[PDB]
């Protein structure tokens, strides 16, 4: 990909500025500079990149259609892969203190963070937090003199926010919300009342669509100072359409793709996720594949969730994703259509990131 | 206290505020709005609002220094509020993640927020971050057409990143520090080598001396438009030297202060923490009791918690605490009498801030 280069060396030279920078200003020692350089290694890198090249396509189609010189090209461009490692590290943030509240094994193919013998859920929560404050130095260092500094911070904190919003959906979506309560044990459901398509929409637009998709699109428009020449509305539909399609996709890989594959190990059966394979079950299987859906979901055996997966395979979930699929197609064409008539060039870049979506098998 | 009538009434409508953000952007529902308003109240409040009052001390005393009409002393004391409860709900989320990190049991005299039953560690590493980004939110928000808004977002996201690096320095300070490395188990240390005044004060100054002192009087500076009116360098180096003391009463707090009194059950000597008894003791004790020091410290055993606690008393300890506080009253009150002669009105705030700190029993 055109920007792989490029985005490469800029990690090279910010991960050499926050490490500098914590030499200069916290008295930081050879050993804890050497975990951090290895921290920051293994949390950031080794992912598809979608999320911090997506920045850097937008900013570069932006800079073409609005014929920016070569010295304005360079610095955009620069200026785009530093957006770009702030998303891949607000991603690193965020999958370090997942894989601690999911307790989960493996992330793009290694032990997760936490699970590093020399690290524990303990360090790891730090560390996660580490990379959060790491996102909004880069900002403040690079973009010092840029007058869209303000705009990144505000639409970075905000979709911060946002993503803990979702995960809060996430992480309660399994127990009856009317029975949340800080001071009394929540029992897990066994009737599966909540286990709705409003619920999985909810919770996917909120933890995924907003970083994965509205981040680094507006991101781009804001480094290249072009944000004001698209449809916000537009805009911000296809990133919610194309997102939740982008989670929909993630929940059907968690039964279905093999993890070695994948290079994680899912859990959503045994942790009874309101997943979207749980949802298009329980509203469209008959009664009694219902009741043996109940009687197995949530349980760690592993006959258990092999009984969760023949129930899926019956049920034809793969066939009922893909008629989604032709749905998402047919919705995400016709608003790039209408992105299109407005701005062409904007258009070409959210078409790029829905190739890099559409099919996708990792 | 002259503003806290003030800074209650700022609270109800900062949580209305946030509580009703949720609702209008991420379709926040009545039991999760309840959750995260009971989880707000349980964070935020019971502690001495050190913090948060500071600022709104520091913003009236340099507002008062200016002249300005009513409405223009009115909106300097909002402002000032909101910024103590960014304080506040910065220092709620560093609680709540610090708490399941040490695997605490109290806190303002009542539970940990993980350790109620509802919530669990797993829910309140998340609960944690929702707190950490309602603290932008307030500035995105009540500051959105401030000239300070850009300078409170750099002072607090440093000021995050600060507390973390100084977190890490705490959380690796008992294994050899040569021996840190993510891929091995490294047991905690059996001789103490690294157990110094230097790598203490490191500790203490990052981990709390930047967010409990530095922070709030650099906002109460910014919210009113006076930070350029004082000695940047002197204000930094008395901030430095209240933070360590605060953090060196904390210390000895953990050992000889009943834990009903404090409202928390430290266990800086079951984990083997390198407090300021620790090193106190370690670099003043005759060799033999060093030795039954090192075979006793870092132990959940009781009886072992016991001998140092007695080690300690028989080390005078709280004597040689006396004689360090009568050292940092000496140099507090030179730097204050050094800001006075520059700035009487900056300088009446900084003695208020002390007075609140010098000899504190909680
Ligand atoms: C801590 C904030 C939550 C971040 C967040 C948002 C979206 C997806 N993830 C991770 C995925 P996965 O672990 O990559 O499968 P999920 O657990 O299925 O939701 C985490
Ligand atoms: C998560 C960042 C850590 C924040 C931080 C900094 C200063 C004091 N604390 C908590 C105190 P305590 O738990 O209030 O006694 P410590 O555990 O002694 O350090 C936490
Ligand atoms: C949003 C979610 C499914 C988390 C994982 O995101 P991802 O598949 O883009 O992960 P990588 O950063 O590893 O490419
Ligand atoms: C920095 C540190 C000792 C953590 C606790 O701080 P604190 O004693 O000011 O706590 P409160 O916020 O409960 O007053
Ligand atoms: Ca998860
Ligand atoms: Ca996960
Ligand atoms: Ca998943
Ligand atoms: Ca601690
Ligand atoms: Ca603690
Ligand atoms: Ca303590």
Chains 1, 2 share one sequence.
Not at 181 to 186: E, I, M, Y
Not at 203 to 220: D, E, N, S
Not at 229 to 241: E, I, P, R, S
Request: with cysteine; charged share 25%.
């Amino acid at each position: 990909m055109a920007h792989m280069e490029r985005f490469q060396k800029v990690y090279e030279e910010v991960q050499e500025f926050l490490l500098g920078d914590a030499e200069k200003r916290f008295e930081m020692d050879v050993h804890r500079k050497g975990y951090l350089k290895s921290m920051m290694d293994t949390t950031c890198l080794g992912g598809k990149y979608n999320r911090g090249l997506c920045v850097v396509d937008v900013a570069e189609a932006m800079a073409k259609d609005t014929q920016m010189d070569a010295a304005a090209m360079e610095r955009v461009l620069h200026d785009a892969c530093v957006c770009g490692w702030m998303i891949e590290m607000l991603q690193a943030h965020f999958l370090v203190e997942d894989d601690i509240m999911d307790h989960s094994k493996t992330r793009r193919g290694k032990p997760c963070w936490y699970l590093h013998p020399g690290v524990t859920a303990q360090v790891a929560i730090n560390d996660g937090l580490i990379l959060l404050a790491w996102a909004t130095q880069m900002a403040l260092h690079y973009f010092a003199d840029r007058p869209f500094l303000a705009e990144v911070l505000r639409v970075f904190h905000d979709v911060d926010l946002t993503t803990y919003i979702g995960q809060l959906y996430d992480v309660t979506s399994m127990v009856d919300s009317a029975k949340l309560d800080a001071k009394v044990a929540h029992a897990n459901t066994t009737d599966y009342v909540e286990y709705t398509p409003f619920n999985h929409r909810r919770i996917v637009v909120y933890k995924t669509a907003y970083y994965t998709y509205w981040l680094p699109l507006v991101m781009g428009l804001l480094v290249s100072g072009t944000l004001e020449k698209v449809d916000k509305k537009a805009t911000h539909k296809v990133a919610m359409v194309m997102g939740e399609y982008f989670q929909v996709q993630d929940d059907v890989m968690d039964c279905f793709t093999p993890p070695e594959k994948l290079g994680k190990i899912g859990t959503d059966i045994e942790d009874a996720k309101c997943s979207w394979l749980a949802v298009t079950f329980l509203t469209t299987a008959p009664a009694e594949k219902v009741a043996e859906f109940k009687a197995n979901y949530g349980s760690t055996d592993p006959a258990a969730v092999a009984v969760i997966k023949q129930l899926y395979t019956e049920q034809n979930l793969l066939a009922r994703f893909e008629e989604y699929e032709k749905a998402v197609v047919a919705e995400v064409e016709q608003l790039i259509a209408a992105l299109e008539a407005q701005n062409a060039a904007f258009a070409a870049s959210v078409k790029v990131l829905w190739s890099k979506t559409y099919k996708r098998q990792k």
